[PDB]
Amino acid sequence: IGYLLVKHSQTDQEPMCPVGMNKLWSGYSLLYFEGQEKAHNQDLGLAGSCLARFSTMPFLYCNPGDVCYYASRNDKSYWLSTTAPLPMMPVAEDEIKPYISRCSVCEAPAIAIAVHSQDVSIPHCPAGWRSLWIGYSFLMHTAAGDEGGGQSLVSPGSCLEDFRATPFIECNGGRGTCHYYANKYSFWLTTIPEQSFQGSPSADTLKAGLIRTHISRCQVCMKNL
Amino acid sequence: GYLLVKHSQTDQEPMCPVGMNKLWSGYSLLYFEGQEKAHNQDLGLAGSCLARFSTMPFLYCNPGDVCYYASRNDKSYWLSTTAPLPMMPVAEDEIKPYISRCSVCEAPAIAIAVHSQDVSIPHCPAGWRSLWIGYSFLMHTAAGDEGGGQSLVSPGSCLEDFRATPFIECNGGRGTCHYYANKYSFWLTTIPEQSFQGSPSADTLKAGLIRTHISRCQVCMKNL
Amino acid sequence: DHGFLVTRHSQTIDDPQCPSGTKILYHGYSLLYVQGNERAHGQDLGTAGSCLRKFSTMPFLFCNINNVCNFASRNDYSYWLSTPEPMPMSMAPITGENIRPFISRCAVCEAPAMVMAVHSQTIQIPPCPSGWSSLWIGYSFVMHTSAGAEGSGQALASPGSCLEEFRSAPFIECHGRGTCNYYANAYSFWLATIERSEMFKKPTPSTLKAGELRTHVSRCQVCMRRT
Amino acid sequence: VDHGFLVTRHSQTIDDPQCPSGTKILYHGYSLLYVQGNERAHGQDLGTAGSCLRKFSTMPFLFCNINNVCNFASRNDYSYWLSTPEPMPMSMAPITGENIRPFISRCAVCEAPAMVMAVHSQTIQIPPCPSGWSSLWIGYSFVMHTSAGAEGSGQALASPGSCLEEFRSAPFIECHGRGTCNYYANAYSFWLATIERSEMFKKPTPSTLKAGELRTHVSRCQVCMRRT
Amino acid sequence: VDHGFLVTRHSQTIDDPQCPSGTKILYHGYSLLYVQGNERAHGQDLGTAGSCLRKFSTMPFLFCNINNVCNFASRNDYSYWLSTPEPMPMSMAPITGENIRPFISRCAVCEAPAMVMAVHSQTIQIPPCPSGWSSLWIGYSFVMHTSAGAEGSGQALASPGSCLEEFRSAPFIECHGRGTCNYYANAYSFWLATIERSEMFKKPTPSTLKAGELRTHVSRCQVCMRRT
Amino acid sequence: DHGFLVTRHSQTIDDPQCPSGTKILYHGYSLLYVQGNERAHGQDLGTAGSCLRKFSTMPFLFCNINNVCNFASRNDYSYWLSTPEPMPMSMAPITGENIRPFISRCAVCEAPAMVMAVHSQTIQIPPCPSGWSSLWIGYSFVMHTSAGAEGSGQALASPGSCLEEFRSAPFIECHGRGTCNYYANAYSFWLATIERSEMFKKPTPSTLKAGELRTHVSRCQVCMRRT
């Protein structure tokens, strides 16, 4: 019927579509564009987040005076990152490739949804739905200024197979360079020990190795026909 | 009655220059954030020296005649000491060693800051004496796109100690303060050219190779 | 045997029932949006993302470039659709178990076909499109703002833009420290009723009070395609 | 075997657009792009029925508070609508009342037998529809926009809303609760640009385009529907 | 030996405030708090002459662009002014025209022979002026404010502007380019709170105050001027 | 002389002369404001902070919590008062030495007493207060916005709010990359002229064009206390 299943590899290799699902195209994992310091996001679970051709500046803008500017100001683009170790300085042109996650848009027979446990346990797919993958509950992100965006929790985009504290990268449109800056934040649903209603949350600082146990888990499910 | 304000960047209140009467000492207030909107105090003005500290030194009211003190999600930001950064938020008494102290001194003449935008120390103008030398502190950002900045002619833009993270964030209601990764300090750069720089050459500076690229300044006071 | 989801919010402490022709998947609490590091991010009320199995004033954490995450230490928010529970006479923040009676419940249900909302922009109920049948009727909810004037909104084609109970204050604000309350700047935006003669005429300003609110709000209907 | 797929089309003129071949018309309306209340913008994806309202108004919404008071057109809010080719008045002053009518675009909400999507070429060439999918319309890759306060919203790149049939440097008009509408210099429309495969990882070449050459760097798109 | 020190005073009423003893009146005007253009707020410190304009208007400014076009009251902008005790109309609807007059505060720009400053106690007690300084007036510690879009501005804590003589939960009114003014539920005024020395480094004790007890947690201040 | 400073901007490539009764300290380039990490921060034009000895499209750098600073790698801005230099016919960004003719110059001068600005909010020049003498007359400049609608403004009691030359486009935008240009969203805000009868009347909207701009802008005078 035409449902589109989108997969982001979080590696520099395009993901393979499930058998029986024609790959419509593969591309680069687009998180959001920032024009005039205003973020406009693409849902990671939707095909718009998989752009066939990469560029540090994939868009241009125009105003009512009939003037359009391409890469002629100070705009940016943000992309889902690979699990590659973070560079020490900005990377340019070809050195960018290994840092951009790849994606594939697959024509599916039924709709895919994401479910979240808000628990260390993996949430079950609803009755009559099968699992496509398991991951971590990716909720939102912020970077430059107070700009950023977030994922829809019922969208496969909110379920990333690989947890990464800094799951995306920032590209300087005009310089053709990308980098990971200290102000980048990723937000994730937490695991909640209580059955369904949590009391005043107990503040905590989690360091490498003690993080994943506090991140909600999810599964992407597809209706069995 | 000119007011000279000094921030120690240590947990010790600074001493006023000779001849200047100390009006009060306090804690180095950078800005308040109410409703996620920053309202800054110029570090060169007496308002940046608050006698009594608190993670929540303000309250707010609306036209319905209701005021709330520490009953929402506001914050306060303070100039930091040069103390090593904590690994986790500090609470109550553990906050003290992280808050810079200040003194407000009654001066006989006006004080200004001058910046070289060079590795060299800028001269005080003819007829003015130097009170101190420092680094050109321009602005800062923290939570969201909120933050603030200093006036370059104000002594507040000339900090004696360069610190990559010169201020701390206090959670009003929790009574805790901490340094988060999104904190940024901005400083005037040194420019090799005489007065007009060409397309800037991007660079990443790491510990030990930083200070040589930060503009220097002097705080000067008119000689009477 | 396709399956589509439809999310419904009771706006009360009771679980809502799935509409006719759909089957229950799970019940939860109605999350409207969250605000992290001063950025609001909502979950469309017409999607399962607005129905969380577990409630918390701080249902998320954030991680930095040094691979260090922090939970509830800062000043972030979570917002939830609320119930008719009266705001405490003291007007002071609500905490712990006392928060429960204020949180709306929701149901996520599996439907045999797609669902959508239509809006009349009048006091009358807009009919379901040709070939679609009614699941419920409501009031046109567009967007909202709260702390820092940050907020989010609903897709007008989504059931999330059609709340069954009009509420001047449809949501409550919670903080990472564990407090929740209604604040004077909590604004709810609804589509207004517009007469045909008012479309291309300067809008007539009006300030409405208790008892005359609901009658100036656009009505809507949530419909499901017949199969 | 119709599951209820919907596709919204915008004429970008005062006439109602026709539903594309293979689809069924449900209703028509006016093209709403986004609204701004208490200085915050909230948009409606142009590919969805939410961007197609039955009634127009420079102030289509009202706001209410916890004190059970609602205010309609009683502050300083905005509404933005896709516009038509109607030229801005010579005076360049705000348009009001009946004079607004010629400026507001119309839309059609249509039911499709199958899933509908947009594909972009990122070149000046029309991207072909996926194998097994048929064409509904072709257009230009429209992705986001900003106006007052640099607030705005955008389109999902796989939504038909990201594929506007008529390129316009000013595809939308700004209206105010007080009843005025106008085009402003900061009303910016953002489009996907043309990117050469060989230049994907090269520093972009800056380009300034003027009347007549605006579309030379605008990506093209096609809206497609699964043939069933 | 007068160097030109200035101090601005606001009556918070429709009458002109008198210059304080020891100072000389230069001129009077209306109390401007801040303006918001293209959704950005820009304030005037209440202790400076910039907060005292000779003429009032709900739209005291205009804006111009690089195309040599200027627009006055032709968008959706705001002006905020300190207000008087005048009660909000029973209808609670926007005030317009002549009806606005009773609501706008007046100010005086005064020349002082010496430096003028404000000091705050952070307690309910009036802070004494520094040794050798004399009193101009006492008040409440007013530090910042926000309104539409949570935009706003504030006062320098050593400026006389941070010391308002009359405490008001709504010290300012919001006006619009279209000619209306009103008080809104999100018009927030922020004041320095009372802090006990022993509790400086303790978690703050939350407090909710209602009519009659509002000032119980508001810091007091005194505006002082150097003698001779 | 207790150390009073007065800053003046030529709004041309030529250094401005210090006003009568004051002495030159130094000349520089007119910095209006900077924008770092999407936050604008201005230097009041009436203060020495708006007069920098050295020009750069990126006169600052930023440092993070890891004690790492970055210079010009991101997308920050600097804005400068500009000259009458016509914007290039190509309308393309200006770089390097070609930027110089667009940057206004300034002078920082030592004055014997305090200085201030007064505004008439009429087409006539407001008189200097009792006991103060004129340094210069101008137009009431209030605030401005540019990229991202971020901006800053002037203190109306400061000489920075009194520009000697009215300009529809008084400033230019520069980027860390080294480019500068005039953009359509660069807005300058000026006090308007108001008749006594218009104060408490609905403002009459007007859209003004070339040749009728300057005559609808409030006038001002910068004055220095006599000693």
Curated annotation (Swiss-Prot), chain B:
Residues bearing PTM 3'-bromotyrosine: 2
Superkingdom in the source lineage: Eukaryota
Disulfide bridge partners, by residue number: 16-105, 49-102, 61-67, 124-220, 158-217, 170-177
Domain Collagen IV NC1: 1-224
Protein's name according to its UniProt entry: Canstatin
Organism this protein belongs to: Homo sapiens
Phylogenetic placement of the source organism: Eukaryota, Metazoa, Chordata, Craniata, Vertebrata
Shown residues within the full chain: 1489 to 1712 of 1712
Swiss-Prot record, chains C, F:
Cross-link (S-Lysyl-methionine sulfilimine (Met-Lys) (interchain with K-1651)): 91
Location in chain, cross-link S-Lysyl-methionine sulfilimine (Lys-Met) (interchain with M-1533): 209
All copies of domain Collagen IV NC1, residue ranges: 3-227
Transmembrane spans: none
Disulfide pairings: 18-109, 51-106, 63-69, 128-223, 162-220, 174-180
Name listed for the protein in its UniProt record: Arresten
Organism: Homo sapiens (Human)
Full-protein residues shown: 1443 to 1669 of 1669
